[PDB]
Amino acid sequence: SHYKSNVRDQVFNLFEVFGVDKVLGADKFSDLDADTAREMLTEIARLAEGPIAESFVEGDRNPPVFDPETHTVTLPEGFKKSMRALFDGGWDKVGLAEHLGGIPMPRALQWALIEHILGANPAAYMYAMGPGMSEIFYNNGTDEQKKWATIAAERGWGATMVLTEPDAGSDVGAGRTKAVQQPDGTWHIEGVKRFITSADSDDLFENIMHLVLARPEGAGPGTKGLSLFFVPKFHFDHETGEIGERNGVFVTNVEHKMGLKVSATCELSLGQHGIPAVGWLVGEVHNGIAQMFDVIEQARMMVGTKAIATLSTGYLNALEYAKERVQGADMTQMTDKTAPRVTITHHPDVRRSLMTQKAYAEGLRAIYLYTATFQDAEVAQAVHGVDGDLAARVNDLLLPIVKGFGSETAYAKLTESLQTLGGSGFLQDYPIEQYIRDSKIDSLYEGTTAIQAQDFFFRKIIRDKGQALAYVAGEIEQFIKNGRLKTERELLATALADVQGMAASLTGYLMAAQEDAASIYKVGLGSVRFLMAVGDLLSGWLLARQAAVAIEKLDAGATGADKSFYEGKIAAASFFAKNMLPLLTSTRQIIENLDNDVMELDEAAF
Amino acid sequence: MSHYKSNVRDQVFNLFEVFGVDKVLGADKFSDLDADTAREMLTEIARLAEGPIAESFVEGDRNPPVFDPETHTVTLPEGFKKSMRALFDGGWDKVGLAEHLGGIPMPRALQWALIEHILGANPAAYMYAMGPGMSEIFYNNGTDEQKKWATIAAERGWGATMVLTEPDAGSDVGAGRTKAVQQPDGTWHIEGVKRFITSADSDDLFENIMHLVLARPEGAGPGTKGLSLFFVPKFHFDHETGEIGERNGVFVTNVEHKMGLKVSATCELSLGQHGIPAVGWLVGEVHNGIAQMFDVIEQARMMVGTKAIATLSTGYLNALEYAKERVQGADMTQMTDKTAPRVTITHHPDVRRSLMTQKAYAEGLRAIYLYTATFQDAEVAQAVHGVDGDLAARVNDLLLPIVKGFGSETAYAKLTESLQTLGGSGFLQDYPIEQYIRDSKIDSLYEGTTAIQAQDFFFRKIIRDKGQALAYVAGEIEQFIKLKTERELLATALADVQGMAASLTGYLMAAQEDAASIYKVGLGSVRFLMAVGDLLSGWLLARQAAVAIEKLDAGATGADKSFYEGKIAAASFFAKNMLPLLTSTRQIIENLDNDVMELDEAAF
Numbered sequence A: 001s002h003y004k005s006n007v008r009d010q011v012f013n014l015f016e017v018f019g020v021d022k023v024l025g026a027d028k029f030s031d032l033d034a035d036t037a038r039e040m041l042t043e044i045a046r047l048a049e050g051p052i053a054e055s056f057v058e059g060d061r062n063p064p065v066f067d068p069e070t071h072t073v074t075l076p077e078g079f080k081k082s083m084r085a086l087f088d089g090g091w092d093k094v095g096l097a098e099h100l101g102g103i104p105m106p107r108a109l110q111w112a113l114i115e116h117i118l119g120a121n122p123a124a125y126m127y128a129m130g131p132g133m134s135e136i137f138y139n140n141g142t143d144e145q146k147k148w149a150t151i152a153a154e155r156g157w158g159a160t161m162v163l164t165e166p167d168a169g170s171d172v173g174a175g176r177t178k179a180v181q182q183p184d185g186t187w188h189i190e191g192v193k194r195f196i197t198s199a200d201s202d203d204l205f206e207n208i209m210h211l212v213l214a215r216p217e218g219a220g221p222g223t224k225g226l227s228l229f230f231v232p233k234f235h236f237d238h239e240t241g242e243i244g245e246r247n248g249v250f251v252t253n254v255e256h257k258m259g260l261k262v263s264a265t266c267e268l269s270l271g272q273h274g275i276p277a278v279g280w281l282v283g284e285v286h287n288g289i290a291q292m293f294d295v296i297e298q299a300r301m302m303v304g305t306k307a308i309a310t311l312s313t314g315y316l317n318a319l320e321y322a323k324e325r326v327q328g329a330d331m332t333q334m335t336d337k338t339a340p341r342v343t344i345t346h347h348p349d350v351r352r353s354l355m356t357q358k359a360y361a362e363g364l365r366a367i368y369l370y371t372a373t374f375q376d377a378e379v380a381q382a383v384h385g386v387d388g389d390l391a392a393r394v395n396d397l398l399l400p401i402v403k404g405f406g407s408e409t410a411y412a413k414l415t416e417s418l419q420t421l422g423g424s425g426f427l428q429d430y431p432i433e434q435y436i437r438d439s440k441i442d443s444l445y446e447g448t449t450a451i452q453a454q455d456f457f458f459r460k461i462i463r464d465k466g467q468a469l470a471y472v473a474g475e476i477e478q479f480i481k482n483g484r485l486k487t488e489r490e491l492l493a494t495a496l497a498d499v500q501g502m503a504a505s506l507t508g509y510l511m512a513a514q515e516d517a518a519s520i521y522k523v524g525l526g527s528v529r530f531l532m533a534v535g536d537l538l539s540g541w542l543l544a545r546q547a548a549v550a551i552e553k554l555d556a557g558a559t560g561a562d563k564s565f566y567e568g569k570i571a572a573a574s575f576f577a578k579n580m581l582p583l584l585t586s587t588r589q590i591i592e593n594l595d596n597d598v599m600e601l602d603e604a605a606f
Numbered sequence B: 001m002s003h004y005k006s007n008v009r010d011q012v013f014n015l016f017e018v019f020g021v022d023k024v025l026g027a028d029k030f031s032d033l034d035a036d037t038a039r040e041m042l043t044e045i046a047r048l049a050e051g052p053i054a055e056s057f058v059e060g061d062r063n064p065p066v067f068d069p070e071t072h073t074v075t076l077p078e079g080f081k082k083s084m085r086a087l088f089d090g091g092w093d094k095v096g097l098a099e100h101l102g103g104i105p106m107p108r109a110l111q112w113a114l115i116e117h118i119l120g121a122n123p124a125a126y127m128y129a130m131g132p133g134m135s136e137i138f139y140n141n142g143t144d145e146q147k148k149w150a151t152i153a154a155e156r157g158w159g160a161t162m163v164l165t166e167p168d169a170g171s172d173v174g175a176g177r178t179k180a181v182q183q184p185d186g187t188w189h190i191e192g193v194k195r196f197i198t199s200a201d202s203d204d205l206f207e208n209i210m211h212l213v214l215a216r217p218e219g220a221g222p223g224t225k226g227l228s229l230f231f232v233p234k235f236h237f238d239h240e241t242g243e244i245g246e247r248n249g250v251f252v253t254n255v256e257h258k259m260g261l262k263v264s265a266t267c268e269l270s271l272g273q274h275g276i277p278a279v280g281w282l283v284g285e286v287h288n289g290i291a292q293m294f295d296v297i298e299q300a301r302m303m304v305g306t307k308a309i310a311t312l313s314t315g316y317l318n319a320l321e322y323a324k325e326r327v328q329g330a331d332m333t334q335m336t337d338k339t340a341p342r343v344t345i346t347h348h349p350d351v352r353r354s355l356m357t358q359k360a361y362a363e364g365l366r367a368i369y370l371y372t373a374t375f376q377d378a379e380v381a382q383a384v385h386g387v388d389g390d391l392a393a394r395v396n397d398l399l400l401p402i403v404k405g406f407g408s409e410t411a412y413a414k415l416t417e418s419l420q421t422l423g424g425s426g427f428l429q430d431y432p433i434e435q436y437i438r439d440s441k442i443d444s445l446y447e448g449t450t451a452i453q454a455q456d457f458f459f460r461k462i463i464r465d466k467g468q469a470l471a472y473v474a475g476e477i478e479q480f481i482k483l484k485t486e487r488e489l490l491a492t493a494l495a496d497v498q499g500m501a502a503s504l505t506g507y508l509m510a511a512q513e514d515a516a517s518i519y520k521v522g523l524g525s526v527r528f529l530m531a532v533g534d535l536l537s538g539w540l541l542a543r544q545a546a547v548a549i550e551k552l553d554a555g556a557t558g559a560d561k562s563f564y565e566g567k568i569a570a571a572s573f574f575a576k577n578m579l580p581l582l583t584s585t586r587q588i589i590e591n592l593d594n595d596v597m598e599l600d601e602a603a604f
């Protein structure tokens, strides 16, 4: 199959670096032990490498077909077979609450399991997000709505998040879809939404729960005026779940995309076909953007994990290719035109490329798993000694890194993966060109990189009063202040100071905006580079932490494949510190010298 | 209009206001081509590109070529063939062609500016039209008798291919195993399978195809040194009249399914395997293949770089047009006010950052390939630079890997910004940027990968050259440095690149005592190539800004004034936001070690 997994690195992170096994068999996870967690990782990785990856090519080459008269999509049969393999193993219920039929587990294990589906066929996981979205509806719902959410989860209904409109993408608060209150307390939703993932899904599911943002008639402007509504594809019996009459919510177009083709990306028309789109106000309160961000937070974690998953299998495909491809002589024998030909892993530029791919893939894996350790209060306490409030703020700080830095990094470093194959990398015979096309969406949906970087600075640092950022910086400082990693710790110290300098510069521009409003533009100009710098710093630190563990295991006497694995962690941490981190010094100097010339330029001059 | 957005204004600015190529127009080789006619030609081909050539850009990708095993041919979509006919009917496939082959003499700088439009609109169309130019290369390398066949080939507009690559010989051309067996009559029978051959068949576009095939005569030595070049036509023909005769034994056997550039048929080509012989004629009746074939490789490397730049330019201009109309969000100065007016996204800082990044690299790359082309005519190099023919050739050789390697990497990377500017809509096939990205990814791979470009640049174009071309260009940068802030930033960048060159040269020279030292050259080579590209971009943009300042002081108005204002802004932005990174890259190159080379392969 195309999909090459890395359970070994996952288990290294979960158990040898972060110690998530400390909570297994205790309190919420009393019924899940470490051996079982490992077995589940191996099991889903095998399922991903087999039946799920089997339709990865098919979904792209034979993409979904829309019938505009039935407002339905037909998915390729091979992809539906992969979906059934996912459902038959219960993998659309990973980490679902126990009362909804799930297996309780730390979020760090949950996302490690999901990584394999996202690497093998990411749209398959997207289609399978229904039960998790039903749990969010449960948590935000009235007692009666919790009964519907239980049905939806138990029956495996699909689900969507429905926000975007043609004129309201990044600016969610500009949305014009309306909600009209009915005497009996239901609402009729009227509007056209766009770019809705999974808004129809062929016959995968008995029903779909649309979670729709809409503006009640007479509500105020902006996101504050928006409410969230449960809008099912089919009406249903609220006691038994029996599916009833079709609700007035119809797909009216399916986009032709660069990649992720098997994910139906839809225009969704509500109340436009002479049938009301009945919706129920979630929680029977008007609090839409707050409620919908429970969904957005999960989707941003998913997109980041998808990016990392895809870079990982891209790297491992490139590595396998490089080990076998014979081309050229060793550089030490270039002059000799009779020298033996060698496999291309002998060439310095190929080893540079591979170690770049490796270090970023493994640094990103460490980042999303680190982030997830703050998503359970019990895990954050056991592994970090951090209380619930701080853990939540740290998770909030890291999500735009997982999403924003992960999405940008994975796409960029897949360029190196493709390059490693030479001309063959341009062929559809190999999976890397599809990885690139499928990953380009990651920087765009669930909030563009610029929106992630604005969220990160203004909301996760400034509004947070820097508490979460100071916590993470303190952990990096402690690592620095703890022989064989001295050069790496010195390089990390410089990188930490560089990022601190960037944060101070941008905060200074924000303060200056009290006096000259246009000074705020300099925050915008520097925001994305600052986000990427924090990502690089975290990557280098977590890689260096991994190298410290690897040194310990090597000193203790690791042999064989274990020894090679640990040796590679040391090499990745050292390579990243020496080749990636120093660039942050120049980025700091650039951010310190930002000016508004590019903002004052006449638009006609571009 | 079309997907293709051209930039004749920037081309003319470069050709005439910056480099002064008009100095040679109306004189000597170019006596019959004046400046007004050159401008009219650029405008005319730009309109052709925006019109009939671009018309089939989408069709070629969505309805790609089909291989027919019943006939060993490739079929092309009709709309694309209509674009090809528009190209030939206009006589565009003979721009810069030698006069005796029917061409219009012109400076290479003008030639590549004309070609940029075809490459931006539908680059495969130019590739299929490379026949006459390759026939001229055959003419130049051929016997007196062969010159007669090359004249027929160019006159009749035959297609042509360059046939080097094999399944086990890609970057390592010298490992090729395709064989040539001399026949009693002095012809050769070619036997082997070649891979990834562009335009290996082309439907009914042409009456014949000239394959220029590298092969190893029986008993020849092992290296590239042992390869010879052969003229292998698809059809035999009458060497005097050109009448097409019997099929020659050279057949396409598959067409590759590619990420992009789909309408360019990329084929496995089998010689002498469908048992009629592939008859070939030794080019020039001498054994000198790799030297002869590099005449073709040099033009192909210029083409790939120009293609990448052309595609980034139309990607940028599409993103700019979109950004000017897309209303989204309030101005950042009104972020708190959820009642503030919505603005077009060009008002947002990250979008202006993105657009200026795209602009500066697109225009810097255009300046680089036009600057390079000014060294490709001795008469232009003398007129515009005061540089003799020998130095001009060495400087052109130095810059070709920058055009190809730095251009290919840069265009693909900065198209990411172009797509991002469209938001979610950038991921749609409704807009052309996703196809630009797919079509552009090949540029870093064929006609020599980036790593091969960087190794050529350093080992051959610098070390073997004893740094003569490099010192000349560095001297011109230093003279400009001697726009004060931009000149200070350029001074730092020049010193940075000089430090990189010194470090890598040390690693290479130390290899005599410590063989593994050479690996550090390999580790740093691509970063060094890219740093040189960034330095050249920043220098040429600053040179453009100096001209722009002059024209503004002289009273420029209207659209001219806006253009010149944009050049000042691009040069300043590039100097302040791109060049400083070269300082960290220098320190990284100065710190290279062989830990990554000593690591066990199993540890990756």
Ligand SMILES: Cc1cc2nc3c(=O)[nH]c(=O)nc-3n(C[C@H](O)[C@H](O)[C@H](O)COP(=O)(O)OP(=O)(O)OC[C@H]3O[C@@H](n4cnc5c(N)ncnc54)[C@H](O)[C@@H]3O)c2cc1C
Residues within 6 Å of the ligand: A325, A327, A328, A329, A344, A347, A348, A349, A350, A419, A420, A421, A422, A423, A424, A426, B161, B162, B163, B164, B165, B167, B169, B170, B171, B172, B195, B196, B197, B198, B199, B258, B266, B442, B445, B446, B447, B448, B449, B450, B451, B452
């Ligand atoms: C679409 C397409 C069309 C083409 N059309 C033609 C054509 O018409 N005619 C033609 O002659 N060729 C053609 N080619 C081939 C092209 O010229 C390239 O040389 C070829 O694709 C690269 O060789 P390869 O694919 O075997 O990669 P390899 O040579 O196997 O390279 C694989 C990897 O190893 C690296 N590598 C290899 N050797 C070294 C070394 N010594 N030092 C450092 N790194 C090294 C490369 O950089 C690359 O990352 C085409 C290629 C493509 C993709």
Ligand SMILES: Cc1cc2nc3c(=O)[nH]c(=O)nc-3n(C[C@H](O)[C@H](O)[C@H](O)COP(=O)(O)OP(=O)(O)OC[C@H]3O[C@@H](n4cnc5c(N)ncnc54)[C@H](O)[C@@H]3O)c2cc1C
Residues within 6 Å of the ligand: A160, A161, A162, A163, A164, A166, A168, A169, A170, A171, A194, A195, A196, A197, A198, A265, A441, A444, A445, A446, A447, A448, A449, A450, A451, B326, B328, B329, B330, B345, B348, B349, B350, B351, B420, B421, B422, B423, B424, B425, B427
């Ligand atoms: C494949 C796909 C699937 C999707 N699925 C869903 C789904 O299921 N549900 C859903 O609700 N949405 C979905 N979306 C919508 C997605 O969230 C939007 O595409 C995204 O938020 C960007 O919106 P837009 O496309 O309108 O771009 P715009 O908002 O128009 O952005 C255009 C450009 O302007 C920039 N920009 C805009 N505002 C600002 C600002 N204030 N500051 C700085 N820069 C700014 C952006 O960064 C971008 O570069 C999907 C999108 C895609 C591509």
